[PDB]
Amino acid sequence: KCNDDPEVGTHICRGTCKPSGTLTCQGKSHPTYDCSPPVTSSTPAKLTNNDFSEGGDGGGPSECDESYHSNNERIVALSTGWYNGGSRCGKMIRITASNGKSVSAKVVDECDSRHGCDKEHAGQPPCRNNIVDGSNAVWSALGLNKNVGVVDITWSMA
C-alpha cells in the first residue's frame, strides 16, 4: 500500500543521508540523492533488476569499465552514494536475500539518483538511494523471480 519511504524521511503516514531535492516525472515528484546510507558489514538495501547489455533499457555502457555486459554475468549497479564516484568499481560484493541465499556480484555501474525523468534516461525516474540493481543472473542465483521487481536484501563488500 501507499506508505512513507523511510529514506525520504516524510512522516505523513506516521501513527495511522537525506534527499537533495526532487525531479518530477509522470505527474510524480521523485526524491534525488547525492548520498546513500552507511556501508556496513550488513548493509540493508533494495534489489531491483537491470539490463546491462547492448540491447537493453540501461542507457549507456556501464560506468566502471565503459562497456556493456551480458546479463548472465553476476553484476550490479549501486545507488550514487554507494557508487561513490567509482570507488567500488570492479570489486565483489556479497548479497544476501530473505530466503537466506547469497551470491557474489561485481560492481560495474551507478544507479544514478541525481538525474532522471528526461530523454537521456527515457523518462525513467532517478534511482532511489539504497538500491543494488542486479542482472538476471544475480536474481536467479538468489532463487528470486525478477517479476516481483523489488526485494529486500543486505550486502557487504566481499
Ligand SMILES: [Cl-]
Ligand atoms: Cl561493521
